[PDB]
Design a protein around this ligand. Structure first.
Ligand SMILES: Cc1cc2nc3c(=O)[nH]c(=O)nc-3n(C[C@H](O)[C@H](O)[C@H](O)COP(=O)(O)OP(=O)(O)OC[C@H]3O[C@@H](n4cnc5c(N)ncnc54)[C@H](O)[C@@H]3O)c2cc1C
Ligand SMILES: NC(=O)c1ccc[n+]([C@@H]2O[C@H](COP(=O)([O-])OP(=O)(O)OC[C@H]3O[C@@H](n4cnc5c(N)ncnc54)[C@H](OP(=O)(O)O)[C@@H]3O)[C@@H](O)[C@H]2O)c1
Length: 308
């Protein structure tokens, strides 16, 4: 008698792709050092700000999956001569990545530039270090991190993705695995619906890639853009993400009542409110309380949010 089945730790059940998940392999103390392969500005010279797409080599050392983030420790020192603390960035590439070899990672970064009360033009430290990165230079990477935005296991589920600005990042990740990759254990056949809010047309992130996916899966891939400073509803209200969602109110509420519908939200902290406003009315007309229903969805792993 050399064996025994040690009693099992009690565990919560999950509908998301978390099997063999990895978080925090690399710490800021000793980050994984990768190199920049490419770094391109994806917004028009005319857009209010600049957003860049960049790819780093990982030689397969960073075991990330769709929906996770990695931290970046930007080169340099702060005002007190100390190294910079990490900044987190949602991964914009699928687990196998932009080279299809599982040896790279991609980011979608907005260059942060503003002016303080003193009237001084301030440049965000990490975002400017990243957007300035030249191919061939090293970059310190930490993580992976996160389990909230992991894709659902069900390959026939309805996945509603709501994002603003660079919040599109994890959705580009999900969608690559869903429509640009042939997976033995996962071949998506449900309905993927993406809503993306950006300020101008010169700011439409990954527009061409999304259009190729629609041209390849015209049935099960739906795409709706909400250009806030160019588009307007019938009353002249700015077309924010919730204003566009409102044109499909009947349909979305109908999908939300389905049990295989998963909603993901990523981007600005504020997008959260206008959407709940839209949802509270729908449930109300249906004799439902969104406050209680949302609670249920959240616990059922069907209302996933990652905003900052
Ligand atoms: C999980 C997670 C994922 C993220 N994913 C992404 C992503 O994919 N892409 C992305 O670009 N960002 C993402 N971010 C944000 C990112 O981590 C950084 O905060 C961002 O890049 C800015 O950092 P920085 O080092 O450039 O700026 P910092 O040097 O840290 O400066 C930021 C500070 O400047 C001030 N500030 C910022 N904006 C303004 C303003 N408009 N007016 C006045 N003061 C201001 C604030 O005090 C703020 O604390 C994510 C954040 C989290 C938590
Ligand atoms: N995992 C994460 O937590 C994660 C991942 C990626 C990005 N982010 C965060 O999300 C943000 C992305 O910012 P960005 O600079 O890329 O975006 P932005 O370009 O400044 O604007 C995004 C769009 O959303 C609109 N908007 C503003 N307030 C809104 C509101 N309350 N409800 C709905 N829409 C609203 C804006 O309209 P107007 O400009 O006309 O006002 C704009 O069209 C960053 O702050 C980043 O930190 C977080």
């Amino acid at each position: 008698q050399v064996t025994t089945e040690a009693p099992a730790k009690v565990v919560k059940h999950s509908k998301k792709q978390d099997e063999n998940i990895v978080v925090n392999k690399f710490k800021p103390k000793e980050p994984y050092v990768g190199r920049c392969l490419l770094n391109t500005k994806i917004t028009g010279d005319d857009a209010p700000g600049e957003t860049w797409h960049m790819v780093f080599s990982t030689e397969g050392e960073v075991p990330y999956r769709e929906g996770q983030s990695i931290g970046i420790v930007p080169d340099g020192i702060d005002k007190n001569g100390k190294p910079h603390k990490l900044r987190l960035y949602s991964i914009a590439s699928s687990a196998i990545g932009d080279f299809g070899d599982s040896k790279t990672v991609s980011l979608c970064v907005k260059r942060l530039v503003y002016t303080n009360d003193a009237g001084e033009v301030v440049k965000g430290v990490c975002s400017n270090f990243l957007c300035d990165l030249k191919p061939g230079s090293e970059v310190k990477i930490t993580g992976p991190v996160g389990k909230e935005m992991l894709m659902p296991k069900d390959p026939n589920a309805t996945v509603i993705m709501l994002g603003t600005g660079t919040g599109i990042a994890p959705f580009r990740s999900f969608l690559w695995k869903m429509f640009f990759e042939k997976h033995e254990d996962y071949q998506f056949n449900g309905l993927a619906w993406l809503f993306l809010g950006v300020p101008t047309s010169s700011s439409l992130l990954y527009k061409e890639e999304f259009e190729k996916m629609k041209e390849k899966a015209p049935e099960n891939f739906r795409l709706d853009f909400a250009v806030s400073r160019e588009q307007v509803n019938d009353k002249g209200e700015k077309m924010y993400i919730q204003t566009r969602m409102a044109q499909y109110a009947e349909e979305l509420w109908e999908l939300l009542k389905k049990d295989n519908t998963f909603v993901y939200m990523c981007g600005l902290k504020g997008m959260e409110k206008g959407i709940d406003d839209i949802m509270v009315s729908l449930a109300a007309k249906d004799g439902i309380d969104w406050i209680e229903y949302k609670r249920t969805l959240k616990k059922a792993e069907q209302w996933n949010v990652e905003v900052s």
